[PDB]
Symmetry: none
Subunit: 69 residues, 4 copies
Amino acid sequence: FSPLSSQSSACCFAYIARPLPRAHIKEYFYTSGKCSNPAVVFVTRKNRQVCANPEKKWVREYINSLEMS
Amino acid sequence: FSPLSSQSSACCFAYIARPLPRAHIKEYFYTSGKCSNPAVVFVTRKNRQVCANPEKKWVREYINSLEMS
Amino acid sequence: SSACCFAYIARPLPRAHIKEYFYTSGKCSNPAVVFVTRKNRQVCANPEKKWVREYINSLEMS
Amino acid sequence: QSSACCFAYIARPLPRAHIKEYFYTSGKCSNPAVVFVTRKNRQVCANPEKKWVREYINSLEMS
């Protein structure tokens, strides 16, 4: 059955304008397709969730730098 | 200027059907008006964020109980 | 997991996405109508909601 | 010391009817940006590279 979860999902309503410091990032995820806007969230060392636009090259490069491939 | 923040916001897409055990809840918040659905999130002691319908009696009662705790 | 619903969709499902529906077992602690969607999702909904009580008839008028 | 730059851009296009004016932030700013002013006088940052942003401006210009 669905919704597989009654748990909340992180959604984004703005996109950070300039790349945040790569060293401040520890993890990333793509937001749920249920959200109104497509986004990538970067999780900082202090556990903040910064929203970014999936189409941006820097966002994709940071993802590459966080993935083992 | 707006957006005032680049951080994500927790949104809800389904509402838990049966009341959660009151003892398992430690905090609550209403989700952002930017989300598509209005909702209350109850934070459990295991830190799960469970979505609930703001219009239900048990939900408003649990909120009042938390506020007085 | 279970054959029983634990939560109800917060917003009505667009009518065109619905292919079929069924009720869960009367044994389940929560009463529910499940909609089978175009993309084969099984969505739990509150049988009390006005939109549910019209998406069903809309699927059973014949 | 009177903040006037955009640190983030709105993600979803603003309702065209809600916007009455626009301006670009200064070259002093770390990021280039368009600020749309809504009829309730909210000032919202947007990405100048986006099609909807460029279209709103072109529309705002003609009238």
